[PDB]
Design an enzyme around this catalytic site. Structure first.
Site, short mmCIF file in Angstrom:
data_model
loop_
_atom_site.label_atom_id
_atom_site.label_comp_id
_atom_site.label_asym_id
_atom_site.label_seq_id
_atom_site.Cartn_x
_atom_site.Cartn_y
_atom_site.Cartn_z
CB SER A 1 -0.91 0.01 1.22
OG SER A 1 -1.66 1.21 1.26
NE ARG A 2 2.98 2.02 -6.09
CZ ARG A 2 3.69 2.12 -7.20
NH1 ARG A 2 4.48 3.17 -7.40
NH2 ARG A 2 3.63 1.16 -8.12
#
Ligand SMILES: Nc1ncnc2c1ncn2[C@@H]1O[C@H](COP(=O)(O)OP(=O)(O)O)[C@@H](O)[C@H]1O
Ligand SMILES: Nc1ncnc2c1ncn2[C@@H]1O[C@H](COP(=O)(O)OP(=O)(O)O)[C@@H](O)[C@H]1O
Ligand SMILES: Nc1ncnc2c1ncn2[C@@H]1O[C@H](COP(=O)(O)OP(=O)(O)O)[C@@H](O)[C@H]1O
Ligand SMILES: [Mg+2]
Ligand SMILES: [Mg+2]
Ligand SMILES: [Mg+2]
Lengths: 36, 53, 469, 480, 484, 120, 236
Positions: free
Chosen positions: E349-350
């Site tokens: 999850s950036r």
């Protein structure tokens, strides 16, 4: 050619031979770091 | 004795592993070439379809 | 007096027809050219402009001359429906091909129809017990569901579907439709004789099964439409008689292949690998009709050919999204002598679910799958270095997996000639217990070959004692 | 200028002539050009006709006249073709003058449906120990012959043909088997030599050769198997039996791809057109066993496929495997080691074959197929005592199933050989003496137990009395 | 009159070539005299190329075509909640006309650089593995990717089921309205899915947009766009919406179909030249809006279906490079029955901890690299060696952590239920429990916390954090329960 | 070569070095004429092109033309369309190996890799 | 940027994320512009199009432009025509790797594949060059050993071989660095290490001065000082 068997390229490109190279090796470093 | 038995058994296993690897190389060489041919054809088909229109 | 045109162009299956008057036939209409043998049926495919339609022939076009007269029938190809189709053999345009006279049905129905709407769906989770260990254990089928049997050339699709017919079609109660699409004429001959000899067809009595055929000797138009024909007969049993219908199709790939033979002739720019651009929609318009409604149920088993053993080929690739269960047959498994050549990882079911099969079943499956997975993962080492280079925990798993692989094999009754081994039909409950016991270690002292090509665990013990002698 | 029956060439290229006129031409009608070259009406469009040439492009110019023939592509057929060599259109090419035809048949004829058929139950005896014992072929069946280049494929087909002399000389019409051999894409000299070989063995008188060789226009090569099937069908349709060899269908597919690409049909998998399967399925479907009502005739097909580097997974190989009733797979590795016929037992099968094996042979060969597949598996891993014996048998059996080319054996010769091997009576003899054994054992039996061989030939089945008598004859020869 | 109407020149394969329609706009809806609708995509000198939103069985040469004056649009508003529609907003649930607040175009510009604010609020999936290791925030685009039957729809469906907690409340700022887009799926798959949502009383806050496998390619192409517009009504009026695109693989295929049939020269793999744009313009419409613009958000869970684990294929690679990370489902894991089958090392999850509930971030400090410390020692076991007893500590822990992250379907957990569990596992309070009993341990431990420490859970729920006071209160309650 | 056979009844040798270049040039000409390439980019007429050359190399009543042909193997793939089609015409091979010759043997022909259909 | 360079005489920095999207955009409309496609679905004008953009991003007598361009590599394939055609335009290339990143090494820089025009004794001084070269030799030799380790294990490694392995492993880790902007991902505050520090610190390790210090000390830290500080912190 050099490292073509042993060195870790991406996960999802793994040999069992890559997997064991990192296993036998990580163990070795652990033992030596424990002694020092 | 157990040492001369272990070298001999390792020379046996290493002869096998080497022979098996050779066969693997032959199977994958053949696979490589099928895939090589397909990639050339497939890449060209895309080009042809784009040219036709 | 009816609407008539003239042929203006012919290439293979595609016949262009001009209509001199104001009125053009609708897309999907059946046209007819009178021949001295009878008639050649044409399905309208496109309006080309300038009063001309493009059509797909349902038979060979050799002989056609530009100018030949063509008649609009005012509707799509239609087929007899109802009980008068049972025990008969019918082609793509509803004609009998069994030399037993007209099919005296009250009604005929078009072979093209809309699938049931969203509103008309009816969903369920009822298991269909097959008697086949690998399917019942690892990927059960669904009643009123869609089942696909994937396989390359010669790995066992037809033997498989025949065993399913053998195991399910007699004691079903509802009716069956079998549709041969683009397969072997001889296989149809075989099946007809076999169904007579099981009573499923009964020429001088009551019949339970309708047969529709358009085999690999047929031109593409016929192979492209014959599945719709068999389907239409199943739809009627479902909707008007509220029946639980079985629809068997060998081989549904041949519908897509047929489509691809005419696609360029129709003027379409080709999509990937030479397929028609309408691949997915054409398939959707077919498969979505093969479904269970509030009026009735359709259980469908479909052989799905895999071109050049490539599961990513557009045709089988697009077929996956339509199935509740998928049995994938593997060449590598068949060459090891495992029949049915089922790939235990890669065949799937919506139903492998604790809520449906119970926690015990579910957990046995997971452990079998885990064991087989561990074994696959080690194939590298094994082949190069040898069995001697595994851990002892891993040696055991490989031993156990090799026995599970063999235990998943099974002698089919329709295979008795190929095997010389009497067919076995193993109950689901016994498959679970038998595999549970094998996982628990209770049979680690038994040699491998004893698990090969038998039924339940009693047969393993039996064969082991025989092998001891 | 009657533009209904006649046309002018608009353009010519890539094997194709665009023609103006020919208004009354039928789709797939044969036409004739000024120079005498023939062609087929493929696309009838408005204001032009696309014609596929049965010859060189040089033979047609723009502006030249073209005539209707009135005929869908057809071919002479009938028994008068026996002993002759023809091109894809049925023209004699052997120098022996005109063909005496019973009539003409179209190149494309739809295969019989379900009803006119009956299941196959009569043997096609090849004379090859390995084939007849392991993968027996029946009349009406399609049996693929598949393997790489130089693995013995033609030779299998050729020995089967030479074998038919045994019945084709007799007076029993039901046992006869007329042979059609189709050379597609092959070297002309190779075909010329093959024909001489057939003449040398007196096999030509019951054979017909349809040849479209490597230098002939692709459409002729594409056409040859179909016109040949029509030729074979005359026998099928008139209460007789024919065997057709398509040698080979790989080259037919390549020729058909040539046309397809030049006509600009979209290339698919491996550049072949979408209908390349239909090319072969429409063809092989025509091989069939017909019912009593229909005369009981048959046409048996031995299509041939050449694989590249053992690739049985390729497009064309998989197409044909999924048409035929099994395959005889010929393996280069076995061929290299001198195992010939190079049959891979585990990959070879004959679907409708057992029902049409000679019973005597079925009886003496129980387990022989499974054992040999298991034995090879064992020999691969190979000093366990049990696995030393399985190794002993398989080595003898393997050796026993080797066979020189051009030397098919009668069934009554095959059963005594196979009986010996399968029942241990060779376990003692030296490997290098198995061939010496065969010819000596047969000589012995032919002079000392001739009535034994006679009952086997005449009844095709072994009673307990006859089996026992054979045991005695074997042990007796083994000792000496 | 050829300005406002036109005449069919030719029709086939869902394409109509039309003479006239001189004043037509690009992307305008048209009506055919038989009733079927279409969309003008090719405006050429002598003709218009129209793609049909239905069967062409009824369209014919010479037939009249009428402009509608309108760029392709869809109804929007809160009245669509609990409804099942087709790609154009027509009802398909059999419940009468749609209660529409207004109409939005199918294609709408994504919010620019300025109207956005950094993603900071949780979308709580209720999935232990997701919420702990790959937390998703309001306004984020997170890909779900994997072969068929690897759990992709399941992941998104649980997330929808989870929103029940806040949606039943009255606080509008914690509510998450759900849009599910079915693209190229079977009708029965969609019917089954809305049966589930009805059985968990989740339909009331869900909108289902369906363009199923038998429907014309333009409908399958359009559905994710019209669904976006539906989801944006929430985004634009200070509310929060979650959109699932299930899946974009099949949308790309539909786009290819119509584009080939419009005779547009194809590009790579016969997909249109702008196939990346198809997806990039769609997903950019998910956004966390600024305070000035009402603080609303649209969060996207696009689904991509790989084949044989090939993430390097054309379309998968396109979408991977668009989203803010990916949840990567693997068959190898799903077969063992470790479900959800999330590959931890590859799922990212950036956005990161910024989107995670603070209380969960605390208890799962190292958890992700702790399953890189455990995955490391997983190779040590088949190495055969029996050493590093210090390793044994982490070697055992990871195996228990893996069993803790397993989770049944249709069973999402509240954060107050998750946080304890993660705390228990990470600090080694599980290292002394049997592997086969971790399942029962979970449901009992949470019975125990509801029975006795009911205020402890309420604390985590309301505050979303753990003070040094709570951290030890939980520690004490944990060490307590270990002894049955 | 053919003239020596037809007019003077000789047994002629024809040498072609390299046969692959004949194939390759055929492929270029085909591409330039706008013909749709076949598998691996080769000309659709690959096999007939080859046949129109090779079939002229044969024995007649007057004499013979025998041909020895250098055969390049693209990417060392014997299954490549060029050699695969060429090989269909080969009655024999003479394989010269560098493994040999280094051992001082001339002509450096591998006595096992070199094969003939006429060793019958 | 060009105006600042030429008229303002400036030393400009031009940052581009992401330059691949330029070639890709051209790709997206190429067929509709009526071009026959080239390889891999790309426009035939790929190279010249890129030229006409890159040759403008340069340094003239009027001034200087330094540009940092992010170059997406589709499916990690560096042979994809887009990244491939980019290499010739670059004075220095920083090649990232999924393989490196998956081992926890950030920045995920491939120490061998990345290049520079300015890795030159004449430019950085013979000391710098020598350190770099032997770090690279150490890492290369490491790869060759990882093969032997895969099959044969540890027992066939010399004492120097095992030392090479140990040092390379420390070198790899020592190449990692906490970034300021990566703070939300790392937790660890970012470090900035001066060039002189870097060369000095790596030279020291190449000579042998830290063979007694365990790996973890070299991972995710700044200069050589931060190594010793971490080494002592893990002792306690
Ligand atoms: N269940 C089975 N048991 C034994 N042999 C089988 C079985 N299934 C298939 N085979 C073998 O595979 C051959 C081809 O089977 P078939 O069903 O015709 O394959 P397909 O329909 O997939 O092309 C059979 O003739 C038989 O030799
Ligand atoms: N049984 C056999 N024993 C010895 N040689 C054989 C035998 N069968 C075939 N051959 C030889 O093997 C070579 C290739 O056989 P052929 O029939 O041409 O195979 P293919 O048709 O597969 O190319 C020929 O030289 C042939 O004479
Ligand atoms: N978390 C889970 N636990 C147990 N089973 C699951 C879980 N997730 C999915 N499944 C099973 O997998 C089947 C198919 O998964 P699905 O989500 O439809 O995968 P996909 O959307 O990738 O095709 C479901 O019917 C269910 O039985
Ligand atoms: Mg079949
Ligand atoms: Mg041959
Ligand atoms: Mg799904």
């Amino acid at each position: 050619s050099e490292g073509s068997t042993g060195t870790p390229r991406g996960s999802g490109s793994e040999d069992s031979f890559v997997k064991r190279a990192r296993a036998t090796e990580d163990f070795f470093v652990r033992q030596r770091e424990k002694e020092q | 004795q157990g040492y001369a038995a272990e070298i001999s058994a390792r020379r046996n296993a290493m002869d096998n592993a080497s022979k098996n690897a050779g066969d693997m190389i032959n199977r994958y060489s053949i696979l490589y070439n099928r895939t090589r041919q397909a990639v050339i054809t497939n890449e060209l088909v895309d080009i042809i379809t784009g040219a036709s229109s | 007096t009816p609407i008539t045109g003239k042929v203006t162009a012919v290439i293979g299956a595609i016949v262009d027809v001009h209509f001199e008057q104001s009125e053009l036939p609708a897309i999907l209409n059946a046209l007819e050219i009178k021949t001295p043998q009878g008639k050649l049926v044409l399905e309208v495919a496109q309006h080309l402009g300038e009063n001309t339609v493009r059509t797909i022939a349902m038979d060979g076009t050799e002989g056609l001359v530009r100018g030949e007269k063509v008649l609009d029938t005012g509707g799509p190809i239609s087929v007899p429906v109802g009980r008068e189709t049972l025990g008969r053999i019918i082609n793509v345009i509803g004609e009998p091909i069994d030399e037993r006279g007209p099919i005296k049905s009250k009604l005929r129905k078009p072979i093209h129809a809309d699938p049931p709407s969203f509103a008309e769906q009816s969903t369920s989770a009822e298991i269909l017990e097959t008697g086949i260990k690998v399917v019942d254990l690892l990927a059960p089928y669904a009643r009123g569901g869609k089942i696909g049997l994937f396989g390359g050339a010669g790995v066992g699709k037809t033997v498989f579907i025949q065993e399913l017919i053998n195991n399910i079609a007699k004691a079903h109660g509802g009716f069956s439709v079998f549709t041969g699409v683009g397969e072997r004429t001889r296989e149809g001959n075989d099946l007809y004789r076999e169904m007579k000899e099981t009573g499923v067809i009964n020429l001088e009595g009551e019949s339970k099964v309708a047969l529709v055929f358009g085999q690999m000797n047929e031109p593409p138009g016929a192979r492209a439409r014959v599945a719709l024909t068999g389907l239409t007969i199943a739809e009627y049993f479902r909707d008007e008689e509220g029946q639980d219908v079985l629809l068997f199709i060998d081989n549904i790939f041949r519908f897509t292949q047929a489509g691809s033979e005419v696609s360029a002739l129709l003027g379409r720019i080709p999509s990937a690998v030479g397929y028609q651009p309408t691949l997915a929609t054409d398939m959707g318009l077919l498969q979505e009709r093969i479904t269970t409604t509030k009026k009735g149920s359709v259980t469908s088993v479909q052989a799905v050919y895999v071109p050049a053993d490539d599961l990513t080929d557009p045709a089988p690739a697009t077929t996956f999204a339509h199935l509740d269960a998928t049995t994938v047959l593997s060449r590598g498994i068949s060459e090891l002598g495992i029949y049915p050549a089922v790939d235990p990882l890669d065949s799937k079911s919506r139903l492998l679910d604790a809520a449906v099969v119970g926690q015990e079943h579910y957990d046995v499956a997971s452990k079998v799958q885990e064991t087989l997975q561990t074994y696959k993962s080690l194939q590298d080492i094994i082949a190069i270095l040898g069995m001697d280079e595994l851990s002892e925990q891993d040696k055991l798993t490989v031993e156990r997996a090799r026995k599970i692989q063999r235990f998943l094999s099974q002698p089919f009754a329709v295979a008795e000639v190929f095997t010389g081994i009497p067919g076995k039909l193993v109950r689901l409950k016994d498959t679970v217990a038998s595999f549970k016991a094998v996982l628990e270690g209770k049979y680690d002292n038994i040699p491998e070959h004893a698990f090969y090509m038998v039924g339940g665990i009693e047969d393993v013990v039996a064969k082991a004692e025989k092998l001891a002698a | 200028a009657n533009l209904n029956e006649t046309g002018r060439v608009l353009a010519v290229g890539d094997g194709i002539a665009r023609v103006f006129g020919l208004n009354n031409i039928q789709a797939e009608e044969l036409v004739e050009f000024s120079s005498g070259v023939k062609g087929m009406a493929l696309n009838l469009e408005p204001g032009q006709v696309g014609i596929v040439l049965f010859g060189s492009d040089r033979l047609v110019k723009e502006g030249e006249l073209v005539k209707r023939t009135g005929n869908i592509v057809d071919v002479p057929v009938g028994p008068g073709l026996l002993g002759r060599v023809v091109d894809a259109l049925g023209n004699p090419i052997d120098g022996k003058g005109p063909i005496d035809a019973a009539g003409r048949s179209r190149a494309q004829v739809k295969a019989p449906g379900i009803l006119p058929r009956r299941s196959v139950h009569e043997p096609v005896q090849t004379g090859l120990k390995a084939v007849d014992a392991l993968v027996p072929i029946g009349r009406g069946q399609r049996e693929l012959i598949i393997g790489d280049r130089q693995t013995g494929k033609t030779a299998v087909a050729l020995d089967t043909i030479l074998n038919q002399k045994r019945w084709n000389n007799g007076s029993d019409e039901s046992k006869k088997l007329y042979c059609v051999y189709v050379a597609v894409g092959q070297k002309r000299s190779t075909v010329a030599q093959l024909v001489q070989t057939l003449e040398q063995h007196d096999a030509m008188k019951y054979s017909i050769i349809v040849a479209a060789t490597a230098s002939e226009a692709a459409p002729l090569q594409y056409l040859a198997p179909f016109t040949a099937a029509s030729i074979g069908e005359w026998f099928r349709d008139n209460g007789k039996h024919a065997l057709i060899v398509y040698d080979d269908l790989s080259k037919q597919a390549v020729a058909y791809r040539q046309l397809s690409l030049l006509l600009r049909r979209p290339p698919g998998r491996e550049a072949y057109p979408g209908d390349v399967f239909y090319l072969h399925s429409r063809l092989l479907e025509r091989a069939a066993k017909l019912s009593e009502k229909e005369g009981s005739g048959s046409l048996t097909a031995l299509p041939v496929i050449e694989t590249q580097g053992g690739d049985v997974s390729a497009y064309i190989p998989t197409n044909v495997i999924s048409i035929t009733d099994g395959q005889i797979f010929l393996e280069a590795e076995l061929f290299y080691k001198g195992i010939r016929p190079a049959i891979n037992v585990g990959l070879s099968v004959s679907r409708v074959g057992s029902a049409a094996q000679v019973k005597a042979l079925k009886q003496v060969a129980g387990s022989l197929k499974l054992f040999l597949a298991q034995y090879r598996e064992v020999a691969a891993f190979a000093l366990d005592a049990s696995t030393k014996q399985t190794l002993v048998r398989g080595e003898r059996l393997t050796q026993l199933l080797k066979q020189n080319q051009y030397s098919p054996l009668a069934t009554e010769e095959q059963v005594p050989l196979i009986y010996a091997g399968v029942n241990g009576h060779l376990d003692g003899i030296e490997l290098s003496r198995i061939g010496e054994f065969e010819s000596s054992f047969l000589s012995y039996l032919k002079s000392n137990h001739n009535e034994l061989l006679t009952e086997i030939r005449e009844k095709g089945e072994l009673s307990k009395e006859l089996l026992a008598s054979l045991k005695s004859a074997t042990e007796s020869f083994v000792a000496t």
